Amino acid sequence: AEVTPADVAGDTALSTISDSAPADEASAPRWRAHVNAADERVKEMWAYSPSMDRNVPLVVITADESAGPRPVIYLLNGGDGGEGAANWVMQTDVLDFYLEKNVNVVIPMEGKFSYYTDWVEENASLGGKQMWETFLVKELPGPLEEKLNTDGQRAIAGMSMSATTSLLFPQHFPGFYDAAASFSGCAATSSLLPWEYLKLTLDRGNATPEQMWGPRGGEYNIYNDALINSDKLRGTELYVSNASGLAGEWESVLNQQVQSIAMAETVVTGGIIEAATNKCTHDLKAKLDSAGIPADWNLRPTGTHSWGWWQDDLRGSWTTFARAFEL
Ligand SMILES: OC[C@H]1O[C@H](O[C@H]2O[C@H](CO)[C@@H](O)[C@H](O)[C@H]2O)[C@H](O)[C@@H](O)[C@@H]1O
Ligand SMILES: *[C@@H](O)[C@H](CCCCC)[C@H](O)CCCCC
Ligand SMILES: [Cl-]
Ligand SMILES: [Cl-]
Ligand SMILES: [Cl-]
Ligand SMILES: [Cl-]
């Protein structure tokens, strides 16, 4: 990319990267065993965020030295944030897949129910002050890309809640990202229905969308509406997809009365989630097509599980990334 970390960081106090977890860590994260069993190129790093006063864990797939400096992909988890079991590391072969591609991949393992944005208000249930856009865009790239010896190219990818984030970041900082991948989300956030979809994610973290982006339709909410500001994506290589499934983000790939009742619910909820995302994606495509902004589209049918589609999204988005990075 032509825009450097220092170009977007400006005044911002930068992150400090450590190769070891804080000594005050009480218990080992669930994902640590997965890192420890993967190739030596998969590393656990920790980035201190000055704005949040938080140590953020990162699962990093490092490139080999056979071709020198390589690009970096910032891959975001959904609502889980990497703080539970419903994430890239624990539900997909993300580590093995990218190891073979020879590319740097950085997966933050904190940020549950945050939309990876800068929140207007604090929320103790989510760690207090949330400044994930400042962290991911301004605090982290400079020191981390230096440590990884990247070639100066970068991409942002997100799924579900962070499939809004991966469209907002390149719009907020045009030219910073070479590519952006949005894996099954809703670009719109200020319209009636899209605002209510923010509540599905935020209710799980004891939060409201007003704490995050202020009043619906307000200045900051519109700034964070990726459908309204879709034209600002021009210049970025894009990959937009669908992870339509019955068993969603919560599900990994007793009596027959309760086994059939619970199964009836996933078909219904997965169906409402699929329908909601399908329209959001259709509106974005119509808006980008009308503006002459090209994207790689992976609109898929209803699958058995959403995580099966999300693992397939790592493959699908590789065509966008290989093209944007000239690999
Ligand atoms: O779709 C908009 C509404 O989404 C949430 O509520 C729905 O989902 C809950 C959990 O499955 C149900 O209990 C509830 O009946 C649904 O309406 C959100 O909590 C609402 O505020 C939104 O209007
Ligand atoms: C992620 O696809 C999804 C929210 C997408 C926005 C369109 C509805 C999430 O799984 C659904 C809510 C489950 C609780 C986190
Ligand atoms: Cl250290
Ligand atoms: Cl901490
Ligand atoms: Cl494969
Ligand atoms: Cl609070």
Numbering used by the authors: 30 to 282, 290 to 363
Mind quoting what the paper says about this structure?
The mycolate transfer from TMM to various acceptors are known to be catalyzed by mycoloyltransferases (Myts), a family of enzymes specifically present in all members of Corynebacteriales. Porin mycoloylation is abolished in a mutant strain deleted for the gene encoding MytC, one of the six mycoloyltransferases described in C. glutamicum proving that this protein is either directly or indirectly involved in this modification.
We tested both the TMM-C13:0 (analog 2), a water-soluble analog of TMM and TMP (analog 6), the previously characterized inhibitor of the reaction. The Polder map shows that S189 Oγ atom forms an ester bond with the carbonyl of the analog. This structure will be further referred to as the MytC-acyl enzyme (MytC with catalytic S189 esterified). The β-hydroxyl group, a determinant for PorA modification by MytC, does not establish polar interactions with MytC. The MytC catalytic triad residues S189, H341, and E310 are clearly in an inactive configuration: the H341 Nδ is at a distance of 14.8 Å from the S189 Oγ and 13.5 Å from the E310 Oε1. In the apoform, a small helix (η3) contained between residues 270 to 280, is positioned between S189, H341 and E310, blocking the active site pocket. This helix unfolds in the MytC-acyl enzyme structure to form an irregular loop, becoming part of the active site wall, thereby providing space for the binding of the α-alkyl moiety of the mycolate chain C13:0.
